[PDB]
Amino acid sequence: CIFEVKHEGKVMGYACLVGDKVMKPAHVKGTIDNADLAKLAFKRSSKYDLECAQIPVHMKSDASKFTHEKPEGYYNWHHGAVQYSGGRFTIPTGAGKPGDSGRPIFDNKGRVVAIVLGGANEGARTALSVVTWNKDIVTKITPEGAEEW
Amino acid sequence: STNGTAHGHPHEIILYYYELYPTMTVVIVSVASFVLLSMVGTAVGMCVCARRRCITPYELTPGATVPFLLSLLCCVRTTKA
Amino acid sequence: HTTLGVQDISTTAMSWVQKITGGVGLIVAVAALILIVVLCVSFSRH
């Protein structure tokens, strides 16, 4: 589900197969390091700093679901456990660095809950800046002073 | 000399050309062309606005279809497969 | 004497044709504004 955007042979960010689309932050330079994915036609959206396309039928089995359902508590992500509360995802400062954008924040049933874009350092913990699903539609939460990873 | 009847409708309108003229009609034609351009520009803007409306709901997931009819001719045809 | 630059008559008839032009311009102006309004609604929604 996770694929890496490369630029001049260097990993800039990531691309993710969520739902039935293929996502990757718009700001990320490079092209998805995957033939099938690279040749696609993406639709940019500067408001969301998102850039989606549709997953080829032969990879649709490889997507990762999603959900608007996110009760206060702990979520899962590659570097550990994210914490959700007060309408904000946070992590121990230091556990997320530039080059972690695109990485999904799963729940315990595997449903992708948000996609990290960057984080604002507010001391002990960093409030993440994520792309999250609302009632049905996509949304973007960006804590004051975020540093785009 | 020539007769510049009233109309009608239009018809006569062109008859006046002969009366006081060389010109007259050409300027009116230019004005008509400008009006057409305004009409065309409006339509182009409207289509772009229609895109602006179908935007958001351009990603994926159920949710119209739905308002896609009633739905400014695309809307649909668009929702589907 | 006579001879001068119009426009002039012929009233009525003249108004008939004039009324046909400019109305569509107002329509597309209003529609443009309405589209902007909806756009702002979306911006607020986000």
UniProtKB/Swiss-Prot annotation, chain C:
Record PTM text: N-glycosylated.
Entry's localization field: Virion membrane; Host cell membrane
Positions in the Cytoplasmic compartment: 44-46
Record field: transmembrane: 23-43
Signal peptide: none
Membrane-related topology note: Single-pass type I membrane protein
Domain of life: Viruses
Lipidation (S-stearoyl cysteine): 40
Lipid moiety-binding region (S-palmitoyl cysteine): 40
Description of how the protein assembles with itself and partners: Interacts with spike glycoprotein E2. The precursor of protein E3/E2 and E1 form a heterodimer shortly after synthesis. Processing of the precursor of protein E3/E2 into E2 and E3 results in a heterodimer of the spike glycoproteins E2 and E1. Spike at virion surface are constituted of three E2-E1 heterodimers. After target cell attachment and endocytosis, E1 change conformation to form homotrimers. Interacts with 6K protein. Interacts with host MXRA8; this interaction mediates virus entry. The interaction involves 2 adjacent E2-E1 heterodimers.
Function as written in the Swiss-Prot or TrEMBL entry: Class II viral fusion protein. Fusion activity is inactive as long as E1 is bound to E2 in mature virion. After virus attachment to target cell via host MXRA8 and endocytosis, acidification of the endosome induce dissociation of E1/E2 heterodimer and concomitant trimerization of the E1 subunits. This E1 trimer is fusion active, and promotes release of viral nucleocapsid in cytoplasm after endosome and viral membrane fusion. Efficient fusion requires the presence of cholesterol and sphingolipid in the target membrane.
The name this protein goes by in its record: Spike glycoprotein E1
Source organism of the structure: Chikungunya virus (strain 37997)
Part of the intact protein present: 1203 to 1248 of 1248
